[PDB]
Amino acid sequence: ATSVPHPKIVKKYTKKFKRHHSDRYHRVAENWRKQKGIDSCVRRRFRGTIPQPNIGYGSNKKTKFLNPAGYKVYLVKNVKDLDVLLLHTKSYAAEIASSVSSRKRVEIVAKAKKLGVKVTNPKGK
RNA sequence: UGCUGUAAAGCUGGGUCGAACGGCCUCUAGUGCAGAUCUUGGUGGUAGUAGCAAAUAUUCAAAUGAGAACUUUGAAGACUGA
Numbered sequence: 315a316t317s318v319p320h321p322k323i324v325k326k327y328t329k330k331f332k333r334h335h336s337d338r339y340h341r342v343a344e345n346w347r348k349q350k351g352i353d354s355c356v357r358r359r360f361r362g363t364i365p366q367p368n369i370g371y372g373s374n375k376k377t378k379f380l381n382p383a384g385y386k387v388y389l390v391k392n393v394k395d396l397d398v399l400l401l402h403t404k405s406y407a408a409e410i411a412s413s414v415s416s417r418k419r420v421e422i423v424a425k426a427k428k429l430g431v432k433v434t435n436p437k438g439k
Numbered sequence: 440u441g442c443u444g445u446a447a448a449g450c451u452g453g454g455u456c457g458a459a460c461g462g463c464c465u466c467u468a469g470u471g472c473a474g475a476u477c478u479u480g481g482u483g484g485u486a487g488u489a490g491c492a493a494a495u496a497u498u499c500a501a502a503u504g505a506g507a508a509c510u511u512u513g514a515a516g517a518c519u520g521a
């Protein structure tokens with residue numbers, strides 16, 4: 315890891331918690347919703363039903379918010395936004411906003427390279 | 440295209456697009472939908488399916504026309520039957 319050393323990052327659940335019957339119906343979106351029905355097999359946690367979000371799956375507080383490279387990602391919209399990462403170049407990486415123009419994005423990439431800040435999306439436009 | 444969050448969700452690559460939009464501290468509310476034989480609009484399967492069967496009945500040729508069972512004319516065969 316090129317970042318500040320950390321314990322091995324553990325993700326207790328790596329899949330996506332998908333709402334019940336978002337596979338059965340198009341009108342039911344995958345965005346997680348807790349079943350509230352009286353008879354629900356999922357709300358009652360029958361064997362074979364889907365896993366549900368709960369606080370037990372919470373991430374280790376020491377590896378939380380770190381991408382696989384070990385950085386915390388901070389959203390940057392202009393070159394002056396990189397100033398808050400001057401003393402955190404080994405623990406925070408910059409991500410250039412999607413609505414930044416191709417010109418200002420070139421300026422942000424050039425200044426980030428000058429400052430040693432890592433950029434999570436260094437290619438797009 | 441991926442990343443972050445247990446999650447509600449946030450951010451991001453590519454494509455499309457064409458004029459506005461967001462983060463943060465607060466304020467406010469007509470603020471979150473799968474259901475209500477919900478409302479309005481739209482769209483399926485059914486399905487090229489049910490069917491297009493009352494009132495006797497049409498046929499040959501020529502003309503016209505891109506195209507004629509169905510139009511026009513001629514010839515015939517019929518019917519309504521005062």
Ligand SMILES: [Mg+2]
Pocket residue numbers: 352353
């Ligand atoms: Mg019960």
Ligand SMILES: [Mg+2]
Pocket residue numbers: 457
């Ligand atoms: Mg315009």
Ligand SMILES: [Mg+2]
Pocket residue numbers: none
């Ligand atoms: Mg504002």
Ligand SMILES: [Mg+2]
Pocket residue numbers: 469
């Ligand atoms: Mg309302």
Ligand SMILES: [Mg+2]
Pocket residue numbers: 341
């Ligand atoms: Mg609905």
Ligand SMILES: [Mg+2]
Pocket residue numbers: 474
């Ligand atoms: Mg409901």
Ligand SMILES: [Mg+2]
Pocket residue numbers: none
């Ligand atoms: Mg209905």
Ligand SMILES: [Mg+2]
Pocket residue numbers: none
């Ligand atoms: Mg309707």
Ligand SMILES: [Mg+2]
Pocket residue numbers: none
């Ligand atoms: Mg038929």
Ligand SMILES: [Mg+2]
Pocket residue numbers: 492
């Ligand atoms: Mg019939």
Ligand SMILES: [Mg+2]
Pocket residue numbers: 518520
């Ligand atoms: Mg007679």
